[PDB]
Amino acid sequence: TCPFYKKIPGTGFTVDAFQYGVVEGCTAYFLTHFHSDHYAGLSKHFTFPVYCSEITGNLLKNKLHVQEQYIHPLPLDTECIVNGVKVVLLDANHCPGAVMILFYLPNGTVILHTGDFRADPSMERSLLADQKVHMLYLDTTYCSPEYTFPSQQEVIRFAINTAFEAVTLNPHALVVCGTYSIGKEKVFLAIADVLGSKVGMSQEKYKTLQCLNIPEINSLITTDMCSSLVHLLPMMQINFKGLQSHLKKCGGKYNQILAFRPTGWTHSNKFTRIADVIPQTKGNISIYGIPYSEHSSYLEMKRFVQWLKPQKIIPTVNVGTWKSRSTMEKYFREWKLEAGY
Ligand code: NI
């Protein structure tokens, strides 16, 4: 059944709750972003109002074929009334179109649901600065102090410099980047840009990218693989076997592959720096795992929450085990005692 952490009290609203069939008493289904564990269950046969960003609405229409009459896009940073309740959508700094949602309950309670987010000090100067938030529905993906990672900017710098050096030394080297969802487009776009290439990809992925309102996108991407020296492939194909295979397909246009696997966290984060990362190499193929995260580090999360000073925290991630639940509750209490709310 629909879990309690997907329900917004005092409304008939649910968040990211599309795989339980009809939810008893739900008059509006919000969708924070277009990632499959969150939209799971949506299709052309859905007949309830879906509230979301413009970009998430483009994906629902073009990729899922949800009918236009059930899609209700809202602008960001704008007070809107939905079924008699004031709401605001804020940028979540996750993937394209991802939002946080502020609900202003008739009784005076204010609730923030983060969806998936990477907390950033810039959020401290959005519309959140303007009033008190009583309850926080929090993305707790990396809520443990072992989870450190570099800035997105540091990681892109590394990838750009790595690719540029490699292709400048060998003009017959191919760059490949893995993907399995929207998110992390900066990785392959930044690399393509330094190399004066467009990025080449399948027709399904090009379609997905054309929904995201990226400026000048027609200048940056293409379905013509042969004309491009940065290819995107399914993350599943980013290994020696799938890469050797792929190399054959280009017909001796390239003799070397340099590939990037943008992971979340991996245990080498607890020892190694970004300047000190190394690839796995078999022959003329090298694979780099780069820690490009679209979720809060532990420190970023802790700073956001100690700034917000919520009265109650409801986790939305890692809630399935008693051990995780108890560990998270311990950090929340530490934060509160250190900060004095
Ligand atoms: Ni996500």
Short mmCIF file of C-alpha atoms and ligand atoms in Angstrom, two decimals:
data_model
loop_
_atom_site.label_atom_id
_atom_site.label_comp_id
_atom_site.label_asym_id
_atom_site.label_seq_id
_atom_site.Cartn_x
_atom_site.Cartn_y
_atom_site.Cartn_z
CA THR A 1 0.00 0.00 0.00
CA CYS A 2 1.02 3.69 -0.47
CA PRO A 3 3.49 4.49 2.29
CA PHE A 4 2.86 7.33 4.69
CA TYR A 5 5.98 9.23 3.57
CA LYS A 6 4.34 9.74 0.08
CA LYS A 7 1.21 11.40 1.56
CA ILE A 8 0.85 15.10 2.39
CA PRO A 9 -1.39 15.48 5.54
CA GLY A 10 -4.43 17.77 5.31
CA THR A 11 -4.58 17.60 1.58
CA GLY A 12 -5.69 15.05 -0.90
CA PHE A 13 -2.13 15.16 -2.37
CA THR A 14 0.51 12.44 -2.96
CA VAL A 15 4.10 12.77 -4.20
CA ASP A 16 5.78 10.33 -6.55
CA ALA A 17 3.03 7.70 -5.83
CA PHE A 18 2.05 6.32 -9.25
CA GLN A 19 2.46 2.51 -8.69
CA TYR A 20 -0.33 1.78 -6.13
CA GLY A 21 -3.23 2.14 -8.56
CA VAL A 22 -5.86 4.57 -7.33
CA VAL A 23 -4.88 5.99 -3.94
CA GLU A 24 -8.00 6.37 -1.76
CA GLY A 25 -8.67 10.08 -1.36
CA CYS A 26 -6.07 11.47 -3.81
CA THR A 27 -7.29 14.37 -5.93
CA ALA A 28 -3.83 15.42 -7.32
CA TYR A 29 -0.63 13.38 -7.96
CA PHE A 30 2.59 15.48 -7.95
CA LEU A 31 5.69 14.14 -9.76
CA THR A 32 9.03 15.69 -8.61
CA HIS A 33 11.14 14.47 -11.60
CA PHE A 34 11.43 12.05 -14.53
CA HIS A 35 13.36 9.14 -12.97
CA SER A 36 11.78 5.68 -13.26
CA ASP A 37 11.51 4.76 -9.50
CA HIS A 38 9.57 8.07 -9.11
CA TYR A 39 7.23 7.90 -12.20
CA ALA A 40 6.85 4.12 -12.01
CA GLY A 41 3.36 3.27 -13.06
CA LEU A 42 2.52 6.31 -15.28
CA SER A 43 1.36 5.66 -18.94
CA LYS A 44 -1.12 6.79 -21.68
CA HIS A 45 -3.97 5.25 -19.59
CA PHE A 46 -3.61 7.55 -16.56
CA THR A 47 -6.74 9.76 -15.97
CA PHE A 48 -5.89 11.90 -12.86
CA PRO A 49 -4.32 15.35 -12.70
CA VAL A 50 -0.46 15.23 -12.66
CA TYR A 51 1.29 18.36 -11.42
CA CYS A 52 5.00 18.89 -12.37
CA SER A 53 7.51 21.19 -14.01
CA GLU A 54 7.36 22.15 -17.77
CA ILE A 55 10.31 19.86 -18.58
CA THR A 56 8.84 16.86 -16.72
CA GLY A 57 5.55 17.56 -18.58
CA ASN A 58 7.43 17.41 -22.00
CA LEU A 59 8.87 14.00 -21.05
CA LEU A 60 5.43 12.67 -19.85
CA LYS A 61 3.85 13.64 -23.15
CA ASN A 62 6.66 12.59 -25.57
CA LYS A 63 8.23 9.59 -23.86
CA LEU A 64 5.38 8.08 -21.81
CA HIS A 65 2.45 9.31 -24.04
CA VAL A 66 0.37 10.58 -21.11
CA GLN A 67 -2.53 12.60 -22.56
CA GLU A 68 -2.14 16.34 -22.56
CA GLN A 69 -5.41 17.00 -20.68
CA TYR A 70 -4.04 15.25 -17.48
CA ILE A 71 -0.64 17.04 -17.47
CA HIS A 72 -0.51 20.30 -15.44
CA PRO A 73 2.90 22.01 -15.75
CA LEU A 74 3.71 24.81 -13.29
CA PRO A 75 6.33 27.59 -13.51
CA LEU A 76 9.06 27.70 -10.91
CA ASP A 77 9.38 30.29 -8.14
CA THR A 78 5.69 31.23 -8.46
CA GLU A 79 2.86 31.04 -5.92
CA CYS A 80 0.15 28.78 -7.54
CA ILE A 81 -3.27 27.48 -6.20
CA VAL A 82 -3.95 23.71 -6.72
CA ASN A 83 -7.37 22.39 -5.50
CA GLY A 84 -7.56 25.24 -3.06
CA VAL A 85 -4.01 24.90 -1.63
CA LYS A 86 -1.06 27.36 -2.24
CA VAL A 87 2.08 25.55 -3.61
CA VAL A 88 5.48 26.64 -5.03
CA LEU A 89 7.94 24.52 -7.18
CA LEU A 90 11.68 25.21 -6.55
CA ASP A 91 14.66 23.94 -8.49
CA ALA A 92 16.03 20.80 -6.81
CA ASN A 93 19.60 20.83 -8.42
CA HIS A 94 19.07 17.16 -9.35
CA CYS A 95 18.37 16.28 -13.06
CA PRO A 96 16.62 18.48 -15.70
CA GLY A 97 13.11 19.50 -14.65
CA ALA A 98 13.54 18.16 -10.99
CA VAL A 99 11.72 20.16 -8.35
CA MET A 100 11.15 20.55 -4.65
CA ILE A 101 7.55 21.41 -3.58
CA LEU A 102 6.41 23.83 -0.82
CA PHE A 103 2.84 23.21 0.48
CA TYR A 104 1.04 25.93 2.53
CA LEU A 105 -1.68 24.02 4.46
CA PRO A 106 -4.95 25.75 5.32
CA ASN A 107 -4.17 25.25 9.09
CA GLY A 108 -0.93 27.33 8.74
CA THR A 109 1.56 24.44 8.54
CA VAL A 110 4.27 24.76 5.89
CA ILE A 111 5.75 21.52 4.39
CA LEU A 112 8.80 21.17 2.06
CA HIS A 113 9.19 17.96 0.03
CA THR A 114 12.66 17.90 -1.50
CA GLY A 115 12.05 15.18 -4.04
CA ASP A 116 15.60 14.07 -5.04
CA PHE A 117 18.05 17.03 -4.51
CA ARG A 118 21.67 18.11 -4.20
CA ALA A 119 21.54 20.71 -1.42
CA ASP A 120 23.33 23.95 -2.25
CA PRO A 121 23.81 27.25 -0.34
CA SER A 122 21.92 29.00 -3.27
CA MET A 123 18.74 27.46 -1.92
CA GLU A 124 19.18 29.61 1.24
CA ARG A 125 18.14 32.64 -1.01
CA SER A 126 15.12 31.20 -2.77
CA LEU A 127 11.54 31.64 -1.55
CA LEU A 128 12.47 29.34 1.33
CA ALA A 129 14.11 32.23 3.18
CA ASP A 130 10.71 33.98 3.50
CA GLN A 131 8.95 31.79 6.13
CA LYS A 132 9.27 28.93 8.57
CA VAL A 133 8.95 25.25 7.42
CA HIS A 134 7.51 22.95 10.00
CA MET A 135 7.92 19.56 8.26
CA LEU A 136 10.67 18.38 5.82
CA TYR A 137 10.27 15.28 3.56
CA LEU A 138 14.05 14.75 2.94
CA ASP A 139 16.19 13.01 0.28
CA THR A 140 18.43 10.95 2.61
CA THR A 141 20.30 8.94 -0.08
CA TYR A 142 23.76 9.75 1.34
CA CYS A 143 22.90 10.43 5.00
CA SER A 144 26.14 9.05 6.57
CA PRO A 145 29.49 10.81 7.15
CA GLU A 146 31.49 8.46 4.91
CA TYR A 147 29.75 10.06 1.91
CA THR A 148 32.07 12.87 0.74
CA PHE A 149 32.44 13.82 -2.88
CA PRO A 150 33.91 16.64 -4.93
CA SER A 151 31.98 19.49 -6.47
CA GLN A 152 30.39 18.96 -9.82
CA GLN A 153 32.71 21.74 -11.12
CA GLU A 154 35.89 19.85 -9.97
CA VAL A 155 34.67 16.68 -11.60
CA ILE A 156 33.90 18.33 -14.95
CA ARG A 157 37.32 20.04 -14.95
CA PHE A 158 38.95 16.61 -14.57
CA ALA A 159 36.93 15.03 -17.37
CA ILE A 160 37.51 17.93 -19.81
CA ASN A 161 41.33 17.94 -19.23
CA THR A 162 41.56 14.14 -19.43
CA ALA A 163 39.64 13.89 -22.70
CA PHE A 164 41.42 16.84 -24.32
CA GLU A 165 44.90 15.48 -23.53
CA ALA A 166 43.99 11.95 -24.81
CA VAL A 167 42.48 13.02 -28.14
CA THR A 168 45.22 15.58 -28.72
CA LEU A 169 47.89 12.87 -28.27
CA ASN A 170 45.87 10.39 -30.44
CA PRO A 171 43.40 11.93 -33.01
CA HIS A 172 42.06 8.43 -33.74
CA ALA A 173 40.79 7.94 -30.09
CA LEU A 174 37.02 7.74 -29.46
CA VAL A 175 35.36 9.09 -26.29
CA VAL A 176 32.34 7.20 -24.97
CA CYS A 177 30.07 8.21 -22.03
CA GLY A 178 27.48 5.97 -20.33
CA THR A 179 23.88 6.99 -19.50
CA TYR A 180 20.66 5.20 -18.22
CA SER A 181 18.34 8.07 -17.43
CA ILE A 182 18.24 11.84 -17.68
CA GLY A 183 20.81 13.65 -15.44
CA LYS A 184 24.53 14.34 -15.70
CA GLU A 185 24.29 15.86 -19.22
CA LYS A 186 27.11 18.28 -18.26
CA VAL A 187 29.60 15.38 -18.39
CA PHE A 188 29.16 14.57 -22.11
CA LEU A 189 28.35 18.14 -23.18
CA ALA A 190 31.48 19.63 -21.53
CA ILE A 191 33.69 16.95 -23.13
CA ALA A 192 32.11 17.40 -26.61
CA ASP A 193 32.59 21.15 -26.31
CA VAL A 194 36.36 21.04 -25.61
CA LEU A 195 36.74 18.57 -28.52
CA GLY A 196 34.75 20.68 -31.03
CA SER A 197 32.37 17.79 -31.63
CA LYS A 198 28.59 17.32 -31.23
CA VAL A 199 27.65 14.37 -29.17
CA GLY A 200 26.22 11.44 -30.99
CA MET A 201 23.51 9.10 -29.67
CA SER A 202 20.61 6.83 -30.58
CA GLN A 203 17.30 8.17 -31.80
CA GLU A 204 15.55 7.36 -28.41
CA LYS A 205 18.15 9.32 -26.39
CA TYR A 206 18.16 12.28 -28.84
CA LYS A 207 14.37 12.44 -28.41
CA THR A 208 14.78 12.47 -24.58
CA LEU A 209 17.30 15.29 -24.84
CA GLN A 210 15.11 17.38 -27.16
CA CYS A 211 12.48 17.61 -24.30
CA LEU A 212 14.80 19.37 -21.80
CA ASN A 213 14.78 23.09 -22.91
CA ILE A 214 18.58 23.19 -23.05
CA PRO A 215 19.59 26.39 -24.93
CA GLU A 216 21.15 25.97 -28.43
CA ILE A 217 20.69 22.18 -28.09
CA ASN A 218 20.45 21.75 -31.93
CA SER A 219 24.10 23.00 -32.08
CA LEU A 220 25.35 20.45 -29.48
CA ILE A 221 23.82 17.03 -30.30
CA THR A 222 23.16 14.66 -33.29
CA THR A 223 22.01 11.18 -34.38
CA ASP A 224 24.84 10.92 -36.91
CA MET A 225 27.40 8.73 -35.05
CA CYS A 226 30.10 8.79 -37.71
CA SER A 227 30.42 12.60 -37.76
CA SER A 228 30.89 12.70 -33.92
CA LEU A 229 33.91 11.81 -31.75
CA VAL A 230 31.88 11.69 -28.40
CA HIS A 231 29.38 8.80 -28.33
CA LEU A 232 26.73 8.07 -25.67
CA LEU A 233 25.84 4.45 -25.04
CA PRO A 234 23.66 2.63 -22.51
CA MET A 235 25.54 2.37 -19.18
CA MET A 236 25.22 -1.45 -19.59
CA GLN A 237 27.51 -1.32 -22.64
CA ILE A 238 30.35 0.52 -20.65
CA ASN A 239 32.72 -2.41 -20.12
CA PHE A 240 35.62 -3.95 -22.15
CA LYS A 241 33.37 -6.50 -24.00
CA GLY A 242 30.67 -3.95 -24.99
CA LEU A 243 33.34 -1.36 -25.85
CA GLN A 244 35.49 -3.69 -28.03
CA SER A 245 32.25 -4.67 -29.75
CA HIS A 246 31.34 -1.02 -30.26
CA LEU A 247 34.80 -0.28 -31.65
CA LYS A 248 34.30 -2.81 -34.45
CA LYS A 249 31.08 -0.96 -35.44
CA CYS A 250 32.97 2.25 -36.39
CA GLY A 251 34.91 0.44 -39.16
CA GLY A 252 38.53 1.35 -38.36
CA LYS A 253 37.76 5.08 -37.85
CA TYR A 254 39.25 4.75 -34.31
CA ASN A 255 41.98 2.63 -32.61
CA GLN A 256 41.49 3.66 -28.93
CA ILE A 257 38.49 4.25 -26.61
CA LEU A 258 38.50 6.48 -23.57
CA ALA A 259 35.26 5.94 -21.61
CA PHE A 260 33.58 7.63 -18.59
CA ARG A 261 31.23 5.91 -16.10
CA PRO A 262 29.62 8.69 -14.05
CA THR A 263 28.80 6.81 -10.89
CA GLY A 264 27.27 8.04 -7.63
CA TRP A 265 29.50 7.39 -4.62
CA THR A 266 32.04 4.56 -4.64
CA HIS A 267 34.34 3.49 -1.64
CA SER A 268 37.51 4.96 -3.30
CA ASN A 269 35.93 8.41 -2.34
CA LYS A 270 36.98 7.68 1.28
CA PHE A 271 40.70 7.46 0.25
CA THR A 272 41.46 9.02 -3.14
CA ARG A 273 41.18 12.67 -4.42
CA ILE A 274 39.85 13.75 -7.91
CA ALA A 275 43.37 14.73 -9.08
CA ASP A 276 44.51 11.14 -8.20
CA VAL A 277 41.84 8.96 -10.05
CA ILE A 278 42.98 6.16 -12.42
CA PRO A 279 41.27 4.06 -15.10
CA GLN A 280 40.85 0.32 -15.69
CA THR A 281 42.70 -0.57 -18.93
CA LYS A 282 42.63 -3.60 -21.26
CA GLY A 283 44.51 -3.04 -24.49
CA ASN A 284 43.47 0.10 -26.40
CA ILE A 285 40.41 0.69 -24.06
CA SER A 286 40.35 2.72 -20.78
CA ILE A 287 37.33 3.28 -18.45
CA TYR A 288 37.21 6.06 -15.86
CA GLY A 289 34.67 5.96 -13.00
CA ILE A 290 34.02 9.59 -12.11
CA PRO A 291 32.06 10.59 -8.94
CA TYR A 292 29.60 13.06 -10.44
CA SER A 293 26.70 13.13 -7.89
CA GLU A 294 23.23 14.72 -8.32
CA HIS A 295 22.45 13.99 -4.60
CA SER A 296 23.59 15.90 -1.43
CA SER A 297 26.83 14.82 0.20
CA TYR A 298 26.42 14.24 4.06
CA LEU A 299 27.93 17.71 4.71
CA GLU A 300 25.72 19.52 2.12
CA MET A 301 22.62 17.78 3.58
CA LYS A 302 23.57 18.69 7.18
CA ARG A 303 24.19 22.37 6.26
CA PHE A 304 20.78 22.66 4.46
CA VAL A 305 18.88 21.17 7.40
CA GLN A 306 20.71 23.12 10.13
CA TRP A 307 19.86 26.30 8.06
CA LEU A 308 16.20 25.34 7.59
CA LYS A 309 15.63 24.24 11.26
CA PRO A 310 12.55 22.06 10.58
CA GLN A 311 10.37 20.86 13.56
CA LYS A 312 10.03 17.36 12.09
CA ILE A 313 12.06 15.37 9.45
CA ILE A 314 10.49 12.51 7.39
CA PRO A 315 13.05 10.50 5.33
CA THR A 316 12.10 9.35 1.84
CA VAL A 317 15.25 7.24 1.09
CA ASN A 318 16.78 4.21 2.87
CA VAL A 319 13.60 3.78 4.94
CA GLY A 320 13.27 0.01 4.39
CA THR A 321 15.46 -1.25 7.25
CA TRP A 322 15.31 -0.60 10.95
CA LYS A 323 19.09 -0.15 11.08
CA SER A 324 19.00 2.65 8.43
CA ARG A 325 16.03 4.33 10.07
CA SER A 326 17.71 4.35 13.51
CA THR A 327 21.05 5.61 12.16
CA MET A 328 19.37 8.48 10.33
CA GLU A 329 17.34 9.54 13.41
CA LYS A 330 20.63 9.67 15.40
CA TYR A 331 22.17 12.14 12.86
CA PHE A 332 19.05 14.28 12.86
CA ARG A 333 19.24 14.64 16.72
CA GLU A 334 22.98 15.41 16.57
CA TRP A 335 22.26 18.20 14.06
CA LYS A 336 19.49 19.69 16.10
CA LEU A 337 21.55 19.65 19.37
CA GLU A 338 24.60 21.21 17.70
CA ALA A 339 22.48 23.95 16.09
CA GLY A 340 20.05 24.50 19.01
CA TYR A 341 16.64 24.28 17.31
NI NI B 1 16.33 10.86 -9.01
#
